[PDB]
Ligand binder design. Structure first.
Ligand SMILES: [K+]
Ligand SMILES: [K+]
Ligand SMILES: [K+]
Ligand SMILES: [K+]
Ligand SMILES: [K+]
Ligand SMILES: [K+]
Ligand SMILES: [K+]
Ligand SMILES: [K+]
Ligand SMILES: [K+]
Ligand SMILES: [K+]
Ligand SMILES: [K+]
Ligand SMILES: [K+]
Lengths: 162, 162, 162, 162, 162, 162
């Protein structure tokens, strides 16, 4: 039942860390990563959400082929990666394409292979290893119901801000 | 004499079916194709046109190297692929870059090799084979004069809507 | 238990049809396909096998990332695509990487999603549509036990020829 | 101290000459180059600048990995390529990523290897060789202080126009 | 009637100059080019030929999609680029795929557009501009009959050497 | 003065771990890495060397553009990464292209930026994090003189084995 639009900022396999400027919609290169790592899934954020830090809620989308920075994908949540960085919580909703029967076997976090979840976790735990003052901690996976609650509160924050 | 701007949605060689949202201009992933096929030419639509279905008129552009989703190319028509899908007519104007003398040998539909036209037709006839309820029929090639008439009526519809 | 080496001739996503010359080991471009299609999986043949036609037994390998023409991959069979072309039988063994626990969930043909099997079938049924005199018919999927029997007989033929 | 945003129009290695339309922000294919050449660095323009010809000031950005057309990169100048074409001056500011310590060794034009500067010059001197009526002349490298003066005047022109 | 096998050393679009070692068959990186140029066509040599300098006769092959270094392509000649470098003659036979009806319109040098021939010439005239002591001169196009004579003499030299 | 040939097995940016079989020369896929990491430089081994474990001595080559698996590059050493894995020593010689003046500024280990050396180290320290029983320890950089001594002993071992 829940679905939303994700804007992918960074396709799977990138060492260039792109970000959308949420005031203008422009794509920016934030930085080239300092570690020999690459985003493990397409990565971006959920449109029309607002986290407590004032940015949209982050999203990871499982896909058969990556998209390009800036592309929208209708998606549904199947779990969430809870984590903190140097600025506090920075959780990521894990998603699959909405309306696509090739993904109907993936409904909740236990439907994603551990090898894939462990590689995602490894990326976020280590990608900033060589950036002074930056880190990732308190990182773990939670289920779809918890992810949906996090999306819902972030939708509420967005609507309160309009 | 006739030329127009085409926005390419899908570069040649893609199995990701991108589409521009005509209200916002954003690029969206519609779907990953269900068949092991790839767009045979760069594919998109003609800016400032409106077909009867309320979307712009589709376009195919022959190029020496593909572009990226969302890129504009000034183009001129050399023929049209007439076809119907599950929603009725969904014709495509075949184009070459405007103002480029490397394409001056291509003025009308007979100037495009049959192998290329037959591969284009094959794509549209088969790409939805594995999507239930979707199909393509009544598919054939027509000449530049017919293509230009179709563009002109779609320009008229666009202007009437403003 | 059964495993073998596959030489991949054609990575997933190719419209260039490469083939290894079995006398010299050289990679050759056989042809650019005439249809707007691309190999649905990495494709090649099983080393040290001989089919009745005097060529090695063909193989399809499911992978998380494609390889390059000429690369060896240790693989194990999970089923087979039976088909005939203009020259008679030309079956393909479907395989996954051997010794890799990320594939342990795939043991037999029912463990591969229908969407993937149907796309593979579609490729072989249609890729020669635009080549005169060439075709593919009598095409269907069989299980691992049948695939292993076909591999074994082809290993026997190879050894008899030495 | 000086930094600015560059919009990259053309990634390193491209023979497709993309340009941003400065009225709309859309990316357009200007042309496929007529020579067998490719942009030697990521290439674009400095946001919120206006040259005498009414377009923003051009920029070259040294990067470890190219970006995509339309991407913003915060950059700082280290020199400038002075040149004229068929329409007069068309200088390019040479830049490195701002705020990135991997580039702190590059502060002025003498910090860029001659092989790289000579390849950049070669590109602009020759890329239009096969376009009638188009050329590049009076081409040479100047230092950061001269580049910064050119940026500053172009920022002043931009602000006067608002 | 004449055809031969070409080994492609360098795909279209490369700035890495690969070469096959003719004693071992191994692919080597000769050098990264010093100019911001890229091979305009797939480039290599004709198997079982020997030029006067003791290397096989060079070949350019027109293709719809490039191959990989080391790949064989059955080809037929349609003309030749005569040129000299710092070591004397170093002519290139221009070819199209043999046995492929998509190329039947290309029989001789006048069937290749001037824009393509001029870009090929430009590449060889300029690619060594920034290499001291290296150059290309006396460069021009000749017809298929002249190309075939050059191939034939080089086949004769090869056979005399066995 | 010292130079040698390196066969690159794995281009920069790969998550596919290729290896050459030293008995046959064939390229094999060893495995897809289990971590979201990619080789930080082109990686392979020095031809005509033998380490104590019976395999050639490993090499890392700094390049402006990656090569393809199996390609030879004439190289010279500028330092070495000393490390141990689950099987003992598995050091890597760090190299630049031989005979190429664009690399003449890199003569010893202090001429390579720390950011690059630290990223290389990070790769080897972490790439097997998610493989049970596999690890990398005792990892550090040493100078050219030490690297050359290691190459020389491995050349001696190779020659003793013939
Ligand atoms: K966030
Ligand atoms: K850190
Ligand atoms: K339409
Ligand atoms: K259908
Ligand atoms: K076969
Ligand atoms: K057919
Ligand atoms: K300008
Ligand atoms: K010119
Ligand atoms: K030659
Ligand atoms: K020169
Ligand atoms: K080793
Ligand atoms: K481990």
């Amino acid at each position: 039942h829940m679905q939303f639009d994700v804007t992918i900022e960074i396709p799977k396999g990138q060492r260039n860390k792109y970000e959308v400027d949420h005031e203008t919609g422009r794509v920016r290169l934030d930085r080239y990563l300092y570690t020999p790592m690459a985003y493990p899934t397409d990565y971006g954020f959920i449109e029309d959400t607002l986290g407590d830090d004032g940015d949209p809620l982050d999203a990871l989308v499982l896909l058969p082929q990556p998209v390009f920075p800036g592309v929208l994908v209708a998606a549904r949540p199947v779990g969430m990666f809870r984590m903190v960085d140097e600025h506090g919580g920075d959780d990521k909703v894990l998603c699959v394409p909405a309306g696509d029967p090739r993904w109907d076997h993936v409904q909740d976090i236990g439907d994603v292979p551990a090898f894939e979840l462990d590689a995602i976790k490894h990326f976020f735990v280590h990608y900033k290893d060589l950036e002074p003052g930056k880190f990732v901690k308190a990182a773990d996976w939670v289920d779809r119901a918890e992810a949906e609650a996090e999306v819902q509160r972030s939708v509420e924050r967005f609507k309160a801000g309009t």
